[PDB]
Design a protein around this ligand. Structure first.
Ligand SMILES: Nc1ncnc2c1ncn2[C@@H]1O[C@H](COP(=O)(O)OP(=O)(O)OP(=O)(O)O)[C@@H](O)[C@H]1O
Ligand SMILES: Nc1ncnc2c1ncn2[C@@H]1O[C@H](COP(=O)(O)OP(=O)(O)OP(=O)(O)O)[C@@H](O)[C@H]1O
Ligand SMILES: Nc1ncnc2c1ncn2[C@@H]1O[C@H](COP(=O)(O)OP(=O)(O)OP(=O)(O)O)[C@@H](O)[C@H]1O
Ligand SMILES: Nc1ncnc2c1ncn2[C@@H]1O[C@H](COP(=O)(O)OP(=O)(O)OP(=O)(O)O)[C@@H](O)[C@H]1O
Ligand SMILES: Nc1ncnc2c1ncn2[C@@H]1O[C@H](COP(=O)(O)OP(=O)(O)OP(=O)(O)O)[C@@H](O)[C@H]1O
Ligand SMILES: [Mg+2]
Ligand SMILES: [Mg+2]
Ligand SMILES: [Mg+2]
Ligand SMILES: [Mg+2]
Ligand SMILES: [Mg+2]
Lengths: 248, 279, 293, 298, 282, 262
């Protein structure tokens, strides 16, 4: 919905609009201090800075949020929520898109993604499964150049008010030169015995649960699985009383 | 095709009109590296804004900048007192090796240009070498020419036998333009152009480029005095509570490289701000 | 697609006129290399600005640069007594490899041309090979000529059995149009062309190209003796103390190449200028010291 | 465009007038390839100038030049006793290969042609395939003709999936014209055209093309006899016999190629000239006489 | 551009007349794709001189080359029982597939056209495609016909991103005029055209063109029974000297290509001709 | 040019009459391609047992042309019935089905490469309804060529005139991402299923007698892998078996005169 340089556009297809996102904060599972710190520091000053611009040149938003934990949707719901809550175009990266066909295609794509994130909207960049930047090669040094360099600060002295979330299952092998520029790092433990109660309450909104017992033992039934199979078991025990109801 | 060329020419012409006076012709390739000429009044951080490190602020000025800009003082020595043909800033990530580049581009008028790694890598066979040539030719036509390459250990590197061809002959044209046959002038003038580059590890940049960058300034972690300077410098416009003292934060901060200091200080600046939301 | 043609042709014509007046009809592609002929007046350094390479300079001059200029003196063994196909200046980086090229292009007398490796590689298919033949055609027209390709190891190389196509052809074109079916003449004169190249990585150029340039001069680091003359060559203009032991400087380094010595001399000469500028004196002044460190 | 093509056509017409002597009609494509017809008076190295390898010369002559040129003696044989499709001269770099093609151009008198690989690859699209068809449309208009492609490892070679798509056609147009549908005549003559290809990397030469050139002559480095013969041949023009002992130099040179023996002869042949110049530099101006002497090389 | 145009038109008129006679006016633009119309008599090889290959040589003669030539005896069927449009002839190099193409052009009966790769690739923009239209329109003007693209792996090929879009347009033009919207007639005849192919490798020709030509006959390496006949069928005029045990060379060759078996035979055939070196002696 | 305009007049008259207006010569060349309705042999029933995608066609694209969206892309892999579906559409459309023949677009002149596309759009708008079917649109509309590509979708957005364009590319995710979303509907043409393969077999085996081989029910059990064209090729190879055997038996003697027995 703006002027096109074409190379970056090979990225505009991934630019999710800030509206019509399924975020709906009440639906997310039990996560209090994580959402608290995000809504206080990453998205609160990311918009309406006039309630926040009392101190200039230092109250920008921290350009990097690292979400590390077990494999699951815990590192996805908050990321999708940040964009819809900040009036933010969720410009996903789609890491496999950075694969090399031309000699400098990945380099130009990494340039265009930051160019669009600076020009299009200050919303966020999302790098899921961060392993392209390990720490052991052109694109790796291309990130840290465009991230915080000569063109990062504007004439007013404030940064480009852009955030780049960090999604990865691994830690402490993430190219520490890049880990340095992801200030706010959040350990998100997907397995939760109390958050699972809230997530099951969210799931059972439309599901009929008259005969089955009150939602207590569900908080310990799949105690082993953290967040994924619980999302898959939403229909496991759901249709179980539903086969006989559909046939007759 | 032609429309894109004319549009890039309009960009370069406007950029030269805005940069020259605080217009010259160009070919197809330096017409693209001409979009990297950084205006000095754009980066709002100079030598007065970097803290802790002062000798590097001292060595970058009299040994490099003054020999480059207004060298008429350095005319007593004809060819030997010219400016150092290259500079490199190496150290652990977190210090201000890229922040020094901002100060050099802001508080030293030298026709600063920074070529990104994307400007060098090109799809078509041979365009990368021509881009390097265009860079070193614009650096001559426009020649205080403090060229910058951030993370120079990536576009350059210790070449192996099985290195990619397109990256193995752009390291060669780069060197051939840097101190090649046509480097000096007719009267012996060394053609003042400094290639300032940052890097986290001077271990695989090259064995023939490290000789080219003699002024290699290591940027170590700030000490007990440098941390105090950085704290007193980054809290200029922030709230000043009468109770806390900076020496406590500086003494407790053992490591915490300058970027880490800035981060842990920005995080501390949320104590009074969050309380206003409780209304 | 024509104005660039006119610009390149006028530049090539002016450059060739300059080289000719120092003492003619080119096609579309010979103009691309015609604007790279380096004139002797342009290069300021001669052979007298190289220290310690007096032994290598003799074998690089009397054997390849003066069977090639005035070959009338070498008329008895006209077949054998010709300029070799090329010199390979190989060695660790920072010692005379490009200084010797400068000296040859200045005080050679031959139609020197700097190749500017970007000129070899063109985006269009079948264009690098056209330039590779145009450069040798221009060298034959500029006979005698001394082609120079700094850092041979980039454009050339062991040809990587599965690798790029155009770069494989542009590298297989030197092999064809430099000692090929039409290198010699009707009498035996091999075109009086020498392709001199300076690379800091020997045994990576080619197995079939190291047979082409037979004269390969190793350029090592200076020793205890010729550093004493490299220091003298570098410190030729700076007014000095009546006594500073250059024996100490030449004997203490012991492991630094030519550029590493030039940098030390630069710092030692920058010391007094900085010490004088520290006195907040705006205008120039012709007096200072040279005291060693 | 016409102003340049007219001069081109005039130049190739002059070249063909010089070559054909003891007025063809040419289109634009195989016209510019007429600049490469190498006259026999332009290569002063016959088969009496290469020594050592003789079976390669013998088999080369009596299996190509006698079949290719002078076919009337091979007429009654049929289709078998005819010139082979092509020839591959392979081996280490710097021994005999390019110097065998020189003798075939000077000695065969069979309308030799030097391909000049760059002329194949044209910048425009579908202009390299036209030149590939043109080199065979001109090889047969002045048959017999020997098509020489020096260093057949880049323009040809193992076809891959990730080709340029512009060299894959020149790599396929060539083999479609050189052993294709309309090569043989109405009677069954295979065009009397030979493609001699010299290279040093045989295992990357488009193996489907290796079926085209059957006569593959290995050109190895010289031995105890070939080294001495190359020494005798390269040192012809030199007053070298005060106490010359070439039997010793032939054994000293262990395994260097034929061209390295030549460079050694060069370095050992101009040493006395350097000595004479250094002795005469004391006084006078160089007016060198015929009195140096060759004694011992390195 | 007209005098050379007149030369092209005159030469193509002569060629088309000599092919047809063993009347039609062109548009001067398909006037150069008709220059590859191979004559019937200028191909010295036929079907009776192909030893070894017998299943392929019969499948061509029965199911491809002869639903087309003399098709009136297939009128009992409808859309089926027609000549299948497309042949591949894939196999290793030098095993005798261009020889099969020669034999088909010599003893087929349809107007064989030896369409090269250059005649399809034109320098000007949007002109190579119209040359494709000219090729298929010429095949449709007289429609007993067998188009032949030798080595179909470069002019065709698996299309990638970019890769000279004006070239992928040519493949799209091929497979659009192949069986597009105007392939059949009002009755249902499949245009009466068959395109013969040839290629050392079928792995990247296409996924669409790979099925455009249904019959993909593999020509393998000659075995014992095939080499034992090729080695005897290559020796037509060579005077067989006495005591020549043919069975020895047939087995000692040990699975050699179809052309290398020709070279090994030419060597022995020219051995005595070269031994006739007495004339030099005298 | 006069011959071109004359042939165009004849073809457009034979199309329209089943009232003609002469127009510009540069707009006169594309009008040499107005295919007649009785020229195509195939009908809807000739297509196999798909009868769902063809249902969507007959329910949405042909009703407004008797509004209809602009842009109908075919999706199936090679050999599934894309060109067959487009042929049935051209035969029973009722509009004036005008193809392209992509070479008609690409002219080797500066001011003709887009004049021809403007001519195509002007002819489609002059007589209504119409269809601008482009065989394998992944070639003329890809990722002067730029002028044509831009010229196309600029004239794309032009009662909304009742023009509908239909593309029949055989490849997805490599085709005209700009104009891809601009055309609303895209119809995936999958491979034949059980009932689908049964319909293909029962429709192809129409002229030949009912005993070419064992039976048709058994043959439609192993055709799950092959596409819609390979099944036709296997069917025709099977049909050639009786004719092959009869001709081989007749080769012994007599003149090969046609007979009505396998
Ligand atoms: N000495 C200092 N004084 C003031 N601020 C500093 C200092 N050192 C670091 N900083 C702060 O930390 C950040 C330094 O980022 P910089 O561009 O130097 O990273 P970098 O050195 O390029 O990282 P890398 O070495 O991994 O490339 C800046 O935002 C700056 O405000
Ligand atoms: N023998 C010498 N005498 C005088 N100066 C020297 C000598 N060797 C090196 N230098 C100095 O080094 C610089 C030139 O370096 P040079 O071009 O020889 O390096 P190089 O061998 O080309 O390295 P590379 O091949 O990696 O480019 C000059 O500024 C010159 O003053
Ligand atoms: N048999 C020989 N007799 C005399 N001189 C020879 C012989 N073989 C090689 N030479 C010498 O070698 C040089 C030519 O080498 P040649 O052309 O054979 O190498 P090449 O095969 O072209 O190598 P490449 O193809 O790898 O470049 C000449 O200078 C010639 O004097
Ligand atoms: N059945 C055969 N009878 C006689 N000669 C054969 C036969 N098969 C192959 N040959 C020989 O093979 C040679 C070339 O065969 P052909 O041209 O048909 O293969 P090809 O099409 O060139 O293969 P490719 O093009 O894949 O390399 C001919 O000279 C011919 O003598
Ligand atoms: N459902 C079906 N019913 C009847 N015939 C079918 C069916 N599907 C495919 N066919 C057969 O497929 C053949 C036509 O193939 P088609 O034209 O659909 O390929 P295409 O997809 O257009 O090719 P491309 O993928 O290259 O565009 C016809 O002979 C037709 O009989
Ligand atoms: Mg940095
Ligand atoms: Mg150098
Ligand atoms: Mg050679
Ligand atoms: Mg063949
Ligand atoms: Mg189709």
């Amino acid at each position: 919905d703006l002027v096109l340089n074409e190379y970056e556009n090979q990225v505009a297809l991934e630019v999710v609009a800030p509206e019509d996102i399924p975020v709906g904060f009440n639906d997310i599972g039990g996560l209090d201090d994580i959402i608290e710190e995000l809504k206080e520091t990453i998205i609160y000053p990311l918009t309406m800075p006039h309630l926040y611009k009392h101190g200039g040149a230092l109250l920008a938003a921290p350009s990097g949020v690292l979400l590390y934990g077990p494999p699951g949707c815990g590192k996805t719901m908050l990321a999708k929520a940040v964009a819809h809550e900040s009036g933010a175009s969720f410009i996903n990266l789609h890491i496999s898109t950075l694969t090399e066909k031309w000699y400098g295609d990945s380099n130009k794509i990494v340039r265009a993604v930051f160019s669009l994130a600076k020009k299009l909207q200050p919303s966020i960049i999302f790098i899921d499964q961060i392993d392209a930047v390990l720490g052991t090669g052109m694109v790796k040094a291309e990130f840290m150049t465009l991230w915080d360099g000569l063109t990062s600060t504007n004439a007013s002295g404030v940064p480009n008010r852009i955030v780049v979330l960090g999604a990865t299952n691994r830690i402490n092998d993430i190219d520490e030169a890049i880990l340095r520029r992801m200030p706010k790092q959040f350990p998100v433990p997907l397995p939760g015995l109390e958050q699972r109660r809230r997530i099951l309450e969210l799931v059972l909104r439309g599901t009929k649960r008259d005969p089955d017992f009150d939602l207590d033992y569900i908080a310990r039934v799949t105690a082993g699985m953290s967040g994924s199979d619980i999302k898959e078991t939403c229909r496991d025990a759901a249709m179980a009383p539903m086969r006989e109801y559909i046939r007759q």
